[PDB]
């Protein structure tokens, strides 16, 4: 079921733990790679307990960014200056899911 | 209509021998206020103490010949002349009102009317009566020379609520009234002129007529000139083609405006050849209004209509030989009209300027010619640009001038007129206050191509508070249109934003436009912006900008973890090209500071670093110093201005100085570190391998012990060359630093002692040192008491030798002959020495250079 | 079918491309994560043209290491000294695939 609302932020409380602007938790499930310039990441919603907030030094290197953010036209800007496109965002069995892609650098 | 003017006058009356003066813009209803007061006196509404009142009008008294004051005031009430002496025997129970001054001892002594009026205004006759004067601000000057200790009262007129009420009354239907009121209020400039009831009358009549005919009103209210033009076109019979009448009316309005007269008598109309038959059309059309109190008087509906007709005169075609008329008209020319001195002398031509610009369009001229059949001069487009020197000042225009020019250009509604004018702009400053200004700037500035700097500011009320939706949506749309300057112009190279009451959506749109690849910014600054997410968003947007090389952030913030993430990633990145970074008013815990300073270790481009107004608590400072002792740091400059520092941390600073290999500047202004800290630093400097070349200790609460330490440190072969001291005083130990200067091992080139509380007795030491030293090249003395005796002694001593000194700054008075002679002698014998004699400036040398 | 052979060592040649001692091109196709200590990555063998060796500085930080080592008893050593395990190595319809795993300390 399509959803007409999107999150306006995603902090990184813990590695593989993102909190939107309403303090709900999103968890990444899988990462897809089709070629060098194509990367598609899948986000899932779930409620879990939160530990202490891991600091940036503890997080370490990663493929995903630290913070997204919504921009007009319906595109996200990560923290590495690259733009991410929204693929789809549906509800199934009461479970929220989202899919995002990495656009080629302009 | 009643119940409104009464509502205004009731509150106005309460603000009031006493001398009262009323002043306000035309059409605001001062005469109604005075007449209401007089009627209240008649109806016994006022206090019973007012037993008699007299009405005097310059509108009529300007013509009547010499007579006695008793006869003058009894002319309109013959029956009272028998009681005039009895009435004037009670001067304390009399009220006098003088209406329309700008339009201009014995009561039984015959005298000229001007003399009588001057005497009464001076209280030479009936001193203990009450006076009340009504005049426009233009003529307020004379009352200052005439009146004695008067009081001034200001009128304002209708408000927004009364405008809405008037619209409701006129339209009757709620839907029509509210639609018209909204359409009018959409235009700020036309809304402001709506305070006068007559303007609201015109707007309501025009819009109602258009609505009853089923026409679109949106274009009508877009600009003033369209509205007035439509109304004028809708007030004369069809098919007549009254060219002559229109020319006559234009000429009459022009004469009236130039001469500063607001009323005309039948004789004046006769003088200009105005056939009285045409007065039927002029009146029944509501262009002229006949006064019903004093017969034989006429006036225009409102000032703005007179100005519009004046503009129509100037754009009207001029006939050959019209200079041969039998009268010497009081009419200027276009260049005189557009001159600034004429504007100041006669402030009522400013509006004629805007209207004339508005008439430069082609469609309006076509419609006017079709409706009336006149002929339009085609040289206006060139005559307006002949005064283009007003725009080609070769300097950035002030805010108000830019507002005026943009308003006129928007009135013109022709882009070809805007291009030739906005082409050469190179720097701009903007101060938005409402929607209309945003729309004007968007319309005009899109044609600029050489613009290079820009300073922005948004006032409160433009963007609605954070939570009406449509009201904010219109502003958002216009803002999006306005923010296209940054993306399109690829020469812009400097931006600044300060003291703006923005909202999240606007900031997001601005950043979206700033993140594109057609922008080539090179410097940025943010200062005191609200809300507090703006700083975080801006730090996010400016990551990876290839061109960016400066960046500043200031305000009151608290380091939320998200801000720490962004402000560390801004330096971690690999595309970073930064070269200078400043921070202000940022409060954070020692852990966040520790991780930030850890991140700095990886950066390989930063060169400056300022931390003014930020709290270190000395713990961040010790962490910073313990980070810098490592062998691979890269910072060169460093400034810790006003960071709550003491002598505790100075030891680590000395360790940094002795061990470092890249640090070559420093600054510690506004920190009472103390003589112990100075001692620690001096112990640091003594090491052979010290490489620091600059040092600043302005306003650091140092005493003579610190001066002794500094001299002891300098006595060796150090590498210091620049040193700046101020506020903190070295007077008693000044001889110590003079001895240090005498040392051949010194290498100082500059030295600043601005406001060091020095006494003239000590000039000997400085004179001897300057005569002895070989490397000093600049000295700065200010706010000292050596002005007279010190000048004498220093100039006498320095007359002996030609030292290397090039620039010497001190405060002097050039009114003394002996000091002048000494200065001339010194200059002649030392032509290579420049002496600044005007050190009175109360602005200290900042740390921007250092 | 399962294949006994396996690369002894793997080195990164480009962005998201590796080479073994045989110099076969092994690439990552998908990454599956269940938690920090449970991380899985998939490998496949394809034939592609190799460009200049993108030195590690240009490749940039990544979740995958720069080098992968193999030891008996299902022990793999990475550049960052972490340990990995092999789940299956099979060939089906001519394509060779391998699956890795992450083992908690």
mmCIF file of C-alpha atoms in Angstrom, chain C:
data_model
loop_
_atom_site.group_PDB
_atom_site.id
_atom_site.type_symbol
_atom_site.label_atom_id
_atom_site.label_comp_id
_atom_site.label_asym_id
_atom_site.label_seq_id
_atom_site.Cartn_x
_atom_site.Cartn_y
_atom_site.Cartn_z
ATOM 1 C CA UNK C 1 27.960 -28.432 -7.800
ATOM 2 C CA UNK C 2 30.297 -27.748 -4.891
ATOM 3 C CA UNK C 3 33.919 -27.053 -5.855
ATOM 4 C CA UNK C 4 36.822 -27.873 -3.548
ATOM 5 C CA UNK C 5 39.197 -25.278 -5.008
ATOM 6 C CA UNK C 6 39.198 -21.706 -3.718
ATOM 7 C CA UNK C 7 41.385 -18.597 -4.020
ATOM 8 C CA UNK C 8 44.209 -18.515 -1.497
ATOM 9 C CA UNK C 9 44.323 -14.703 -1.411
ATOM 10 C CA UNK C 10 42.237 -11.871 -2.848
ATOM 11 C CA UNK C 11 43.297 -8.304 -3.650
ATOM 12 C CA UNK C 12 41.211 -5.301 -4.676
ATOM 13 C CA UNK C 13 42.023 -3.978 -8.157
ATOM 14 C CA UNK C 14 39.284 -1.365 -8.682
ATOM 15 C CA UNK C 15 36.134 -0.103 -6.991
ATOM 16 C CA UNK C 16 34.112 -3.229 -6.159
ATOM 17 C CA UNK C 17 36.396 -5.646 -8.022
ATOM 18 C CA UNK C 18 38.903 -8.155 -6.640
ATOM 19 C CA UNK C 19 41.621 -10.398 -8.053
ATOM 20 C CA UNK C 20 42.950 -13.718 -6.786
ATOM 21 C CA UNK C 21 46.328 -15.380 -7.282
ATOM 22 C CA UNK C 22 44.898 -16.839 -10.498
ATOM 23 C CA UNK C 23 43.815 -13.254 -11.357
ATOM 24 C CA UNK C 24 40.185 -14.273 -11.852
ATOM 25 C CA UNK C 25 37.791 -11.351 -11.440
ATOM 26 C CA UNK C 26 35.579 -11.827 -8.373
ATOM 27 C CA UNK C 27 32.946 -9.173 -7.729
ATOM 28 C CA UNK C 28 30.440 -8.476 -4.928
ATOM 29 C CA UNK C 29 26.774 -8.648 -5.942
ATOM 30 C CA UNK C 30 24.768 -8.377 -2.710
ATOM 31 C CA UNK C 31 25.369 -7.795 0.998
ATOM 32 C CA UNK C 32 23.098 -9.247 3.688
ATOM 33 C CA UNK C 33 23.209 -7.976 7.278
ATOM 34 C CA UNK C 34 21.389 -9.325 10.340
ATOM 35 C CA UNK C 35 23.410 -7.457 12.991
ATOM 36 C CA UNK C 36 26.879 -6.088 13.672
ATOM 37 C CA UNK C 37 28.413 -9.489 14.394
ATOM 38 C CA UNK C 38 26.360 -11.189 11.627
ATOM 39 C CA UNK C 39 27.379 -9.888 8.191
ATOM 40 C CA UNK C 40 27.236 -11.757 4.879
ATOM 41 C CA UNK C 41 28.513 -10.899 1.396
ATOM 42 C CA UNK C 42 28.098 -12.704 -1.930
ATOM 43 C CA UNK C 43 30.772 -13.182 -4.599
ATOM 44 C CA UNK C 44 30.579 -14.204 -8.259
ATOM 45 C CA UNK C 45 33.156 -14.858 -10.981
ATOM 46 C CA UNK C 46 32.686 -12.835 -14.171
ATOM 47 C CA UNK C 47 34.979 -11.912 -17.069
ATOM 48 C CA UNK C 48 35.532 -8.157 -17.462
ATOM 49 C CA UNK C 49 38.272 -5.832 -18.695
ATOM 50 C CA UNK C 50 40.536 -4.512 -15.947
ATOM 51 C CA UNK C 51 41.509 -0.849 -15.934
ATOM 52 C CA UNK C 52 44.384 0.791 -14.143
ATOM 53 C CA UNK C 53 44.749 -0.352 -10.515
ATOM 54 C CA UNK C 54 42.683 2.144 -8.538
ATOM 55 C CA UNK C 55 45.022 2.619 -5.599
ATOM 56 C CA UNK C 56 43.335 2.234 -2.189
ATOM 57 C CA UNK C 57 43.372 5.996 -1.585
ATOM 58 C CA UNK C 58 41.014 6.555 -4.525
ATOM 59 C CA UNK C 59 38.757 3.600 -3.690
ATOM 60 C CA UNK C 60 37.931 5.317 -0.408
ATOM 61 C CA UNK C 61 36.569 3.895 2.834
ATOM 62 C CA UNK C 62 34.328 0.864 2.405
ATOM 63 C CA UNK C 63 32.648 -1.861 4.421
ATOM 64 C CA UNK C 64 34.713 -4.446 2.530
ATOM 65 C CA UNK C 65 38.464 -4.748 3.200
ATOM 66 C CA UNK C 66 41.361 -4.340 0.799
ATOM 67 C CA UNK C 67 42.605 -7.935 1.148
ATOM 68 C CA UNK C 68 41.008 -11.296 1.953
ATOM 69 C CA UNK C 69 42.937 -14.353 3.142
ATOM 70 C CA UNK C 70 41.955 -18.012 3.446
ATOM 71 C CA UNK C 71 43.096 -20.522 6.069
ATOM 72 C CA UNK C 72 42.155 -24.126 6.876
ATOM 73 C CA UNK C 73 39.342 -24.942 9.302
ATOM 74 C CA UNK C 74 37.120 -22.353 7.613
ATOM 75 C CA UNK C 75 39.351 -19.470 8.726
ATOM 76 C CA UNK C 76 39.665 -16.350 6.563
ATOM 77 C CA UNK C 77 41.891 -13.390 7.457
ATOM 78 C CA UNK C 78 41.145 -9.874 6.223
ATOM 79 C CA UNK C 79 43.371 -6.811 5.995
ATOM 80 C CA UNK C 80 41.815 -5.383 9.178
ATOM 81 C CA UNK C 81 42.671 -8.636 11.040
ATOM 82 C CA UNK C 82 39.023 -9.741 11.185
ATOM 83 C CA UNK C 83 37.980 -13.351 10.604
ATOM 84 C CA UNK C 84 35.517 -14.684 8.027
ATOM 85 C CA UNK C 85 33.991 -18.067 7.190
ATOM 86 C CA UNK C 86 32.980 -19.734 3.916
ATOM 87 C CA UNK C 87 29.474 -21.201 3.701
ATOM 88 C CA UNK C 88 29.346 -22.677 0.195
ATOM 89 C CA UNK C 89 31.328 -22.600 -3.036
ATOM 90 C CA UNK C 90 29.352 -24.021 -5.966
ATOM 91 C CA UNK C 91 29.178 -23.837 -9.753
ATOM 92 C CA UNK C 92 25.799 -23.990 -11.506
ATOM 93 C CA UNK C 93 25.142 -23.485 -15.221
ATOM 94 C CA UNK C 94 28.716 -22.282 -15.679
ATOM 95 C CA UNK C 95 28.707 -19.510 -13.041
ATOM 96 C CA UNK C 96 30.895 -19.850 -9.942
ATOM 97 C CA UNK C 97 29.685 -18.282 -6.689
ATOM 98 C CA UNK C 98 31.003 -17.995 -3.132
ATOM 99 C CA UNK C 99 29.467 -16.830 0.148
ATOM 100 C CA UNK C 100 31.314 -15.275 3.090
ATOM 101 C CA UNK C 101 30.305 -14.721 6.716
ATOM 102 C CA UNK C 102 31.414 -12.741 9.760
ATOM 103 C CA UNK C 103 32.211 -14.475 13.057
ATOM 104 C CA UNK C 104 31.874 -12.695 16.429
ATOM 105 C CA UNK C 105 35.071 -12.258 18.421
#
